[PDB]
Design an enzyme around this catalytic site. Structure first.
Site, short mmCIF file in Angstrom:
data_model
loop_
_atom_site.label_atom_id
_atom_site.label_comp_id
_atom_site.label_asym_id
_atom_site.label_seq_id
_atom_site.Cartn_x
_atom_site.Cartn_y
_atom_site.Cartn_z
N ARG A 1 -3.14 2.21 -5.94
CA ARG A 1 -2.47 0.91 -7.05
C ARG A 1 -3.57 0.77 -7.92
O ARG A 1 -3.05 0.60 -9.16
CB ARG A 1 -2.58 -0.27 -5.91
N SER A 2 -4.90 0.81 -7.80
CA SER A 2 -5.81 0.73 -9.02
C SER A 2 -5.41 1.81 -9.73
O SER A 2 -5.49 1.54 -11.03
CB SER A 2 -7.27 0.65 -8.60
N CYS B 1 -8.23 -2.15 -5.19
CA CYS B 1 -7.28 -2.11 -4.16
C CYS B 1 -7.76 -1.99 -2.93
O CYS B 1 -8.94 -2.82 -2.58
CB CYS B 1 -6.00 -1.33 -4.39
N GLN C 1 -1.86 7.67 -5.77
CA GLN C 1 -1.64 8.33 -4.44
C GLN C 1 -0.05 8.79 -3.93
O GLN C 1 -0.23 9.48 -2.94
CB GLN C 1 -2.21 7.40 -3.50
N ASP D 1 0.87 -1.35 -0.10
CA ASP D 1 0.29 0.02 -0.06
C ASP D 1 0.75 1.27 -0.10
O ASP D 1 1.85 1.22 0.65
CB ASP D 1 -0.99 0.14 1.24
C1 LIG Z 1 -3.42 8.60 3.16
N1 LIG Z 1 -4.57 8.30 2.49
C2 LIG Z 1 -5.55 7.44 3.38
O1 LIG Z 1 -5.24 6.88 4.41
C3 LIG Z 1 -6.94 7.43 2.99
C4 LIG Z 1 -7.35 6.10 2.81
C5 LIG Z 1 -6.65 5.24 1.51
C6 LIG Z 1 -6.05 3.96 2.03
C7 LIG Z 1 -5.53 2.99 0.85
C8 LIG Z 1 -5.01 3.58 -0.11
N2 LIG Z 1 -4.17 3.11 -1.14
S1 LIG Z 1 -4.89 2.24 -2.19
O2 LIG Z 1 -5.75 1.31 -1.48
O3 LIG Z 1 -3.76 2.03 -2.98
O4 LIG Z 1 -5.99 3.22 -2.95
C9 LIG Z 1 -5.60 5.16 -0.39
C10 LIG Z 1 -6.27 5.94 0.59
C11 LIG Z 1 -6.69 7.19 0.38
N3 LIG Z 1 -6.93 8.06 1.41
C12 LIG Z 1 -7.65 9.39 1.30
O5 LIG Z 1 -7.83 9.94 2.36
O6 LIG Z 1 -7.67 9.82 0.00
C13 LIG Z 1 -7.98 11.14 -0.29
C14 LIG Z 1 -8.43 10.85 -1.97
C15 LIG Z 1 -6.78 11.86 -0.16
C16 LIG Z 1 -9.34 11.41 0.30
CL LIG Z 2 1.26 -2.91 2.52
CL LIG Z 3 -4.71 12.75 -4.45
#
Ligand SMILES: CNC(=O)[C@@H]1Cc2ccc(NS(=O)(=O)O)cc2CN1C(=O)OC(C)(C)C
Ligand SMILES: [Cl-]
Ligand SMILES: [Cl-]
Ligand SMILES: [Cl-]
Ligand SMILES: [Cl-]
Ligand SMILES: [Cl-]
Ligand SMILES: [Mg+2]
Length: 297
Positions: free
Chosen positions: A220-221, A214, A261, A180
């Site tokens: 990742r997606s 993902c 990301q 991740d």
């Molecule tokens: C650091 N970001 C996070 O912890 C969370 C959840 C998450 C989990 C895991 C993630 N990685 S993935 O599983 O490869 O999408 C992404 C995110 C995104 N996230 C957000 O708050 O995203 C935005 C677009 C900024 C609202």
């Molecule tokens: Cl991981």
């Molecule tokens: Cl972003």
């Protein structure tokens, strides 16, 4: 041109800046449905939601909401559905979506447990003799076979609409070693896997859109889909110079927030596309080289 740009960004050390500019320029559209109180338990993350305009609607049958987005790439003529890893209460919805959208393949880029936490439900059966029934959506799902490689597993599943007794073969492509907020081990490992998905026919325009997920369905997606779409664009044109990777990513971001990301995932996307271009432009031999370098056995 992508390779010239890559070198220039690398030389100036400006990946973070380039990546933040994409974030700044990215579309912001409403996610009113995702934020309805009744949908709170259908979302894995508070801040990751499908835009209303591009969300997938379920066809049954009281609440049509799933955290999933249709990424419809007009110029490339390919579509993908990007979705979060299903929750314990949305696995029926997930398979209902696969059925309704006529998807042939599901690409999974995360593990069920990552960093001590459950980042995706166990939404498919792990043993042939222990099939799953989703009573809410009237579907049955059976493991037919699997091919386990070192860093990915391909599964053949049978999905049955119990209402009609129609059955379909779904292929599950499970990348097990993509951390991740991280990147694949090499361009080779990634491309070997992408080409496995391609070779299966799962991305054929004769099927519904492949489902890619993902944990959040964005980092990742987004990386996987960006590389695939860029490769397809240059393949249609037979012209690597015609593909503007950042423009393609911004287009995809019209359909779901947050795709790709980290700056290093953006960097990796360029590496994957530059490497994959060798195959698209007729160096057949690179495909075997990736298979070897990926150490899949
Ligand atoms: C650091 N970001 C996070 O912890 C969370 C959840 C998450 C989990 C895991 C993630 N990685 S993935 O599983 O490869 O999408 C992404 C995110 C995104 N996230 C957000 O708050 O995203 C935005 C677009 C900024 C609202
Ligand atoms: Cl991981
Ligand atoms: Cl972003
Ligand atoms: Cl897993
Ligand atoms: Cl762990
Ligand atoms: Cl879960
Ligand atoms: Mg057994």
């Amino acid at each position: 041109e992508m390779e010239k740009e890559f070198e220039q960004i690398d030389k100036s050390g400006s990946w973070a800046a380039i990546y933040q500019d994409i974030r700044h320029e990215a579309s912001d559209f409403p996610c009113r449905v995702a934020k309805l109180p009744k949908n709170k338990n259908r979302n894995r993350y508070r801040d990751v939601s499908p835009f209303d305009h591009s969300r997938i609607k379920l066809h049954q049958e009281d609440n049509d909401y799933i955290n999933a987005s249709l990424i419809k790439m007009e110029e490339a003529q390919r579509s993908y559905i990007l979705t979060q890893g299903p929750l314990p209460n949305t696995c029926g919805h997930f398979w209902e979506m696969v059925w309704e959208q006529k998807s042939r393949g599901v690409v999974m880029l995360n593990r069920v447990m990552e960093k001590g936490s459950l980042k995706c439900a166990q939404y498919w059966p792990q043993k042939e003799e222990k099939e799953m029934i989703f009573e809410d959506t009237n579907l049955k799902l059976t493991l037919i076979s699997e091919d386990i490689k070192s860093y990915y597993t391909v599964r053949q599943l049978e999905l049955e609409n119990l209402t009609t007794q129609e059955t379909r073969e779904i292929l599950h492509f499970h990348y097990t070693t993509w951390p991740d907020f991280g990147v694949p081990e090499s361009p080779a490992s990634f491309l070997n896997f992408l080409f496995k998905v391609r070779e299966s026919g799962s991305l054929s325009p004769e099927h519904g859109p492949v489902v890619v997920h993902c944990s959040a369905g964005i980092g990742r997606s987004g990386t996987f889909c960006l590389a695939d779409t860029c490769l397809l664009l240059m393949d249609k044109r037979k012209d690597p110079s015609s593909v503007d990777i950042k423009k393609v990513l911004l287009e995809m971001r019209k359909f779901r927030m947050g795709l790709i990301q980290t700056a290093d995932q953006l960097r990796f996307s360029y590496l994957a596309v530059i490497e994959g271009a060798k195959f698209i432009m007729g160096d057949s031999s690179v495909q075997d080289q990736w298979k070897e370098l990926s150490h899949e056995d």
